[PDB]
Design a protein around this motif. Structure first.
Motif, PDB file in Angstrom:
ATOM      1  N   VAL A 171      55.459 -36.448  33.992  1.00 18.28           N
ATOM      2  CA  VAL A 171      55.740 -35.021  34.073  1.00 18.28           C
ATOM      3  C   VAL A 171      54.676 -34.263  33.268  1.00 18.28           C
ATOM      4  N   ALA A 172      54.358 -34.704  32.024  1.00 19.13           N
ATOM      5  CA  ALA A 172      53.319 -34.036  31.195  1.00 19.13           C
ATOM      6  C   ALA A 172      51.953 -33.960  31.868  1.00 19.13           C
ATOM      7  N   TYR A 173      51.613 -34.928  32.745  1.00 20.63           N
ATOM      8  CA  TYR A 173      50.366 -34.949  33.525  1.00 20.63           C
ATOM      9  C   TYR A 173      50.517 -34.103  34.794  1.00 20.63           C
ATOM     10  N   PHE A 202      45.214 -37.694  33.611  1.00 21.42           N
ATOM     11  CA  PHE A 202      45.981 -38.763  34.282  1.00 21.42           C
ATOM     12  C   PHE A 202      44.961 -39.700  34.938  1.00 21.42           C
ATOM     13  N   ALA A 203      43.961 -39.118  35.635  1.00 19.49           N
ATOM     14  CA  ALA A 203      42.885 -39.871  36.286  1.00 19.49           C
ATOM     15  C   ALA A 203      42.125 -40.703  35.242  1.00 19.49           C
ATOM     16  N   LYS A 204      41.788 -40.116  34.050  1.00 16.20           N
ATOM     17  CA  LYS A 204      41.133 -40.855  32.964  1.00 16.20           C
ATOM     18  C   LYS A 204      42.014 -41.986  32.418  1.00 16.20           C
ATOM     19  N   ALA A 205      43.334 -41.737  32.270  1.00 13.68           N
ATOM     20  CA  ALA A 205      44.262 -42.783  31.787  1.00 13.68           C
ATOM     21  C   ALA A 205      44.343 -43.962  32.785  1.00 13.68           C
ATOM     22  N   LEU A 206      44.231 -43.664  34.083  1.00 14.34           N
ATOM     23  CA  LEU A 206      44.258 -44.651  35.166  1.00 14.34           C
ATOM     24  C   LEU A 206      43.017 -45.577  35.062  1.00 14.34           C
ATOM     25  N   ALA A 207      41.902 -45.060  34.481  1.00 14.50           N
ATOM     26  CA  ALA A 207      40.657 -45.802  34.291  1.00 14.50           C
ATOM     27  C   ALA A 207      40.582 -46.523  32.935  1.00 14.50           C
ATOM     28  N   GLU A 208      41.681 -46.577  32.165  1.00 15.86           N
ATOM     29  CA  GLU A 208      41.697 -47.301  30.875  1.00 15.86           C
ATOM     30  C   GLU A 208      41.204 -48.768  31.023  1.00 15.86           C
ATOM     31  N   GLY A 209      40.274 -49.173  30.145  1.00 13.65           N
ATOM     32  CA  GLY A 209      39.670 -50.507  30.118  1.00 13.65           C
ATOM     33  C   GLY A 209      38.367 -50.560  30.897  1.00 13.65           C
ATOM     34  N   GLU A 210      38.118 -49.537  31.698  1.00 13.71           N
ATOM     35  CA  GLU A 210      36.918 -49.436  32.529  1.00 13.71           C
ATOM     36  C   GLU A 210      35.784 -48.751  31.801  1.00 13.71           C
ATOM     37  N   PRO A 217      37.002 -35.895  32.518  1.00 14.35           N
ATOM     38  CA  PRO A 217      37.429 -35.797  33.927  1.00 14.35           C
ATOM     39  C   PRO A 217      37.384 -34.352  34.450  1.00 14.35           C
ATOM     40  N   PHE A 218      37.340 -34.194  35.776  1.00 19.90           N
ATOM     41  CA  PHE A 218      37.287 -32.894  36.438  1.00 19.90           C
ATOM     42  C   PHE A 218      38.652 -32.540  36.993  1.00 19.90           C
ATOM     43  N   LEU A 219      38.941 -31.256  37.030  1.00 24.59           N
ATOM     44  CA  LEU A 219      40.184 -30.731  37.556  1.00 24.59           C
ATOM     45  C   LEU A 219      39.962 -29.668  38.650  1.00 24.59           C
ATOM     46  N   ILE A 220      40.552 -29.916  39.828  1.00 26.80           N
ATOM     47  CA  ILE A 220      40.529 -29.010  40.981  1.00 26.80           C
ATOM     48  C   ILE A 220      41.954 -28.458  41.138  1.00 26.80           C
ATOM     49  N   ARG A 221      42.086 -27.131  41.269  1.00 22.96           N
ATOM     50  CA  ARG A 221      43.381 -26.466  41.452  1.00 22.96           C
ATOM     51  C   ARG A 221      43.206 -25.332  42.466  1.00 22.96           C
ATOM     52  N   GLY A 222      44.210 -25.109  43.306  1.00 25.35           N
ATOM     53  CA  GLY A 222      44.213 -24.026  44.286  1.00 25.35           C
ATOM     54  C   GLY A 222      45.386 -24.098  45.241  1.00 25.35           C
ATOM     55  N   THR A 223      45.624 -23.001  45.984  1.00 27.64           N
ATOM     56  CA  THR A 223      46.708 -22.849  46.960  1.00 27.64           C
ATOM     57  C   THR A 223      46.149 -22.385  48.312  1.00 27.64           C
ATOM     58  N   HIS A 224      46.580 -23.045  49.405  1.00 25.41           N
ATOM     59  CA  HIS A 224      46.232 -22.696  50.780  1.00 25.41           C
ATOM     60  C   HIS A 224      47.504 -22.715  51.625  1.00 25.41           C
ATOM     61  N   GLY A 232      42.742 -34.302  40.073  1.00 25.95           N
ATOM     62  CA  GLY A 232      42.054 -34.736  38.870  1.00 25.95           C
ATOM     63  C   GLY A 232      41.236 -35.969  39.181  1.00 25.95           C
ATOM     64  N   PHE A 233      40.011 -36.059  38.647  1.00 28.37           N
ATOM     65  CA  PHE A 233      39.181 -37.242  38.897  1.00 28.37           C
ATOM     66  C   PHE A 233      38.064 -37.476  37.901  1.00 28.37           C
ATOM     67  N   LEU A 234      37.594 -38.718  37.897  1.00 30.37           N
ATOM     68  CA  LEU A 234      36.383 -39.122  37.195  1.00 30.37           C
ATOM     69  C   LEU A 234      35.880 -40.380  37.887  1.00 30.37           C
ATOM     70  N   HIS A 235      34.723 -40.865  37.443  1.00 24.77           N
ATOM     71  CA  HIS A 235      34.180 -42.075  38.010  1.00 24.77           C
ATOM     72  C   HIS A 235      34.026 -43.136  36.966  1.00 24.77           C
ATOM     73  N   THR A 236      34.162 -44.369  37.394  1.00 26.56           N
ATOM     74  CA  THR A 236      33.894 -45.487  36.517  1.00 26.56           C
ATOM     75  C   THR A 236      32.548 -46.055  36.974  1.00 26.56           C
ATOM     76  N   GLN A 237      32.111 -47.122  36.326  1.00 31.30           N
ATOM     77  CA  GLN A 237      30.915 -47.862  36.712  1.00 31.30           C
ATOM     78  C   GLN A 237      31.284 -49.019  37.683  1.00 31.30           C
ATOM     79  N   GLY A 238      32.549 -49.088  38.091  1.00 32.46           N
ATOM     80  CA  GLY A 238      33.041 -50.131  38.990  1.00 32.46           C
ATOM     81  C   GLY A 238      32.871 -49.763  40.452  1.00 32.46           C
TER      82      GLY A 238
END
Lengths: 366, 366
Positions: A171-173, A202-210, A217-224, A232-238
């Motif tokens: 919920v906090a994420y 949340f995306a960064k926490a999902l990449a823990e250990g990587e 991380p980057f955040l995209i927000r909007g309504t259509h 939310g996203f980031l990249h790993t080296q994997g």
């Protein structure tokens, strides 16, 4: 009385699995999730900024927010305060009333219009009608609900603090900036769940250990239209891609039209930027589908009025349109604002295509 | 624009006497009474406990309450905040919009949901759209309206502090316990108008200069159907009766069904008590009509949904029923609770009848 039938709380008690799925550990925790969902809706409305979840010494659970406080105003049709109606009627607040029906007792406290109100229930019925128990501090508004699931329905089951903690973290994420506090007054732990980073954290926490390609991380927000989009996203080296998808705060494990649209818009936006930035090479191997997603760790969270599912998976073609429009547009801007990251991300996609082309040539040698 | 016509505030400016009666001293003060009436309705609703009326150094007038604060929430139909709609539209808050149309400028401030909002107007039109100007103290709710009647409509007229003071004094008696503060920042006086005694304290003030039969006035309050009844009274040692009547906070100089019912119920209740108390004598002169009202100083204040009048006088047979039921019942109790006063009051009525009978006998002697 004929009202017990009309209020259908007796029917909840006879057929509880129709409301909470079962009478085991999961059904017991669905009582918690329902109360929390009502407190969360108040945060989504923009009134509550912090939520307390307290596991009491007696095994009861308190959920409290600093929102508006459930209206105590007398509903004319029913001739009973709104708080009473919401907790005693299925056929008019469905969730709150199911919790009341399936709890040995429920105490609803409302801080509203400078007053502290209290109403109590047991197994669906009023044990204490609404009454002012005192004055509330000048600026104090909110709701405090305490309940004890019925042992005549659940036996010896008790709340699981790790299950409570998991939901509060999620919920906090999903609600960026909402503070959720967990006080375990049975074991003695006290934890805070607050992340202004939201789905990006949340995306960064999902990449823990990587190994991360970039730390922030980057955040995209909007309504259509009727569909609200959050990414939310980031990249790993994997070389794997990991995309968690949500529709109205619940995980959608089988994806759907929001996942499909995210992947398409993401790939289109990266390709478009590379073309405009002159990152793409004329000849040689060009990054295709999966190449453009390698190392991507993302969280896609949407809000829709009438979502269609199999069993899971989302079918709404509106969701596909909204994710597509919001992501393509904002991602183009992100890449432009962060060309070093944008270039690193595209290079990764180019190297995946190159390695596959190198592997294809090595196959000729056999 | 076509909206000026639909909002009809231009029509208020062309035909102001249709709204405020005229463009002299009385019409100028009707702008004040209208703003105050909106602040008073908030006290009647049970939200505002104190009202400020401030005559500013520049000749403008501020009216402020500690009520809920005019809703700032966006009305979907109009696509404008509720405060804006209420002040700019005749065809949907009639009074507030008439004040806006006929004022050179109007500033509406709203303290609501922890925020301080401000909207400004001139001659019916928005000069400053609604905007948050800061945070409001945690428990501060209310409305602050400041306006300057248009010199292009009223010339050189200015507010009259004695007219403001008279209305505030009347309101403090008609709304028992409401505090109204008057700050004259043109001359330097500051007065408070607060009377928990209400219409009973009003009845005592009406008897100023008179010898009182008893010092503490009585208060009757109650509701019968759609009509709300409030009666304050005491007796003097004089032989006249003085009964002030009100219908929905405005004086009804020609009485009506509320006055008729008060007089009937009062007389019936006094007669009934005397019979039950054994105060009445078997033979000799019996107190009739006027005899039973001698020395009575009373204030009768009613609230009705659809009041019918000539030109003044009230015709509603419902008002006659409600005053009758509430007064008869509560007065019987008063007399019983205060037998010394009850006996003094009936004795007065008996002595008036005796003096008339003595005068009749003296006429035989001629």
């Amino acid at each position: 009385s004929a009202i017990r039938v009309l209020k259908g709380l007796e029917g909840v008690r006879h057929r509880p699995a129709m409301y909470i799925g079962g009478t085991g550990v999961e059904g017991y925790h669905h009582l918690f999730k329902e109360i929390l969902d009502n407190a969360v809706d108040e945060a989504l409305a923009g009134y509550a900024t912090e939520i307390l979840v307290r596991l009491n010494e007696d095994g009861s659970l308190t959920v409290e927010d600093n929102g508006r406080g459930i209206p105590v105003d007398l509903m004319p049709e029913e001739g009973k305060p709104a708080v009473e109606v919401i907790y005693t009627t299925l056929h008019s607040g469905v969730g709150a009333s199911v919790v009341n029906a399936l709890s040995e007792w429920t105490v609803v406290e409302v801080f509203r219009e400078g007053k502290h109100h209290r109403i109590a229930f047991s197994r669906g019925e009023v044990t204490e009608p609404l009454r002012v128990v005192g004055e509330a501090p000048r600026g104090k508004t909110g709701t405090r609900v305490t309940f004890k699931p019925d042992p005549e329905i659940f036996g010896n089951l008790r709340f699981d603090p790790s299950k409570i903690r998991a939901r509060l973290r999620e919920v906090a994420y999903l609600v960026a900036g909402l503070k959720l506090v967990f006080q375990d007054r049975q074991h003695g732990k006290e934890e805070v769940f607050l992340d202004k980073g939201g789905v990006a954290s949340f995306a960064k926490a999902l990449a823990e250990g990587e190994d991360l390609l970039y730390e922030k991380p980057f955040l995209i927000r909007g309504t259509h239209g009727e569909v609200e989009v959050e990414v939310g996203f980031l990249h790993t080296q994997g070389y794997n891609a990991e995309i968690l998808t949500y529709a109205n705060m619940i995980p959608t494990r089988d994806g759907g039209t929001h996942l499909t649209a995210f992947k398409s818009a993401y790939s289109r936006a990266l390709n478009q930027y590379a073309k405009k930035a002159g990152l793409n090479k004329e000849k040689g191997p060009q990054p295709t589908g999966d190449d453009l997603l390698e190392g991507l760790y993302a969280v896609v969270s949407v809000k829709l009025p009438n979502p269609q599912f199999e069993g899971g998976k989302l079918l709404n073609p509106e969701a596909g349109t909204a994710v597509g429009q919001v992501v393509y547009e904002r991602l183009l801007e992100i890449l432009e604002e962060n060309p070093r990251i944008a270039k690193a991300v595209y290079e990764k996609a180019l190297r995946a295509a190159q390695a596959r082309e190198a592997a294809r040539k090595a196959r000729e040698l056999v």
